[PDB]
Amino acid sequence: TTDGVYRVMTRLGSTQVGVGVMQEGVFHTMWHVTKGAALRSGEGRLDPYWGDVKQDLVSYCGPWKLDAAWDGLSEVQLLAVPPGERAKNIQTLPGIFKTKDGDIGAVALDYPAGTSGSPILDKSGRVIGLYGNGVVIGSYVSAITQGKR
Amino acid sequence: VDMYIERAGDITWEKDAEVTGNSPRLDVALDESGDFSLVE
């Protein structure tokens, strides 16, 4: 239940299917990582609480807690947790997804699929969204996907 | 199929992070299935 970034694993052997963020007793990840399935954490079980396929987000144990947003000007850091690798920080200046409903920050970083759900951070260390829903231009570009608190 | 979580670190900015990646400006659309697609 400790705050932090977590691998999301599945079981012959084990495979990392994604990443998520524990904050304020709530686990945050991308819908496409878990499809809302229950998660084991030690001897405990985490059940989904809120989720939305269009936003590609899901929270466990309580409502979505992450609310910081990219300021539109500053570099950010992807706290990538790739399969088989130590958590590591990748700094970048986001580009922009321009949509009919407004602009979304986007990071032009291409890590393995099991990195989906890794948090993107602002300079204060706040999570401004999660990595792993995006488009191809041949490079992948991820939206900075943030929920509503 | 059992899905389970393992802690991998603190959520912290790192002063000495590797820096990379460009900053593209893209017109996109988001459909009902959560899929982004390019628009022209």
Residues spanned by the domain of A131:
76-143
Q: Are the CB atoms for B40 and A110 separated by under 8 Å?
A: no
Q: Is B13 on the interface with A (CB under 8 A)?
A: yes
- Residues from chain A that touch B7, judged by Cβ atoms under 8 A, are 2, 4-6, 22
The experimental technique used to determine this model is X-ray
Looking at A61-145, list the stretches that DSSP marks H as alpha helix, in order from N- to C-terminal side: none
Active site residue A103: no
Tell which of A14, A33, A60 closes a domain. Answer: A60
Q: Does B3 touch chain A (CB under 8 A)?
A: yes
Whether the CB-CB separation of A106 and A97 falls below 8 Å is answered with: yes
Classify residue A36: in a domain, yes or no.
yes
Q: How many distinct structural domains can be found in chain A?
A: 2
Q: Where are the domains of chain B?
A: 2-40
Residue A70 lies in a domain: no
- Is there a catalytic annotation at residue A116? yes
Task: Tokens for A22, please give them.
Answer: 């524990």
Of B10, B18, B28, the CB nearest to A91: B18
Tell me, yes or no, whether A80 and A55 share the same domain.
Answer: no
Half-sphere exposure of A125 (CA within 13 A, CB side): 10
Residues 6+ apart with CB under 8 A from A125: B11, B12, B13
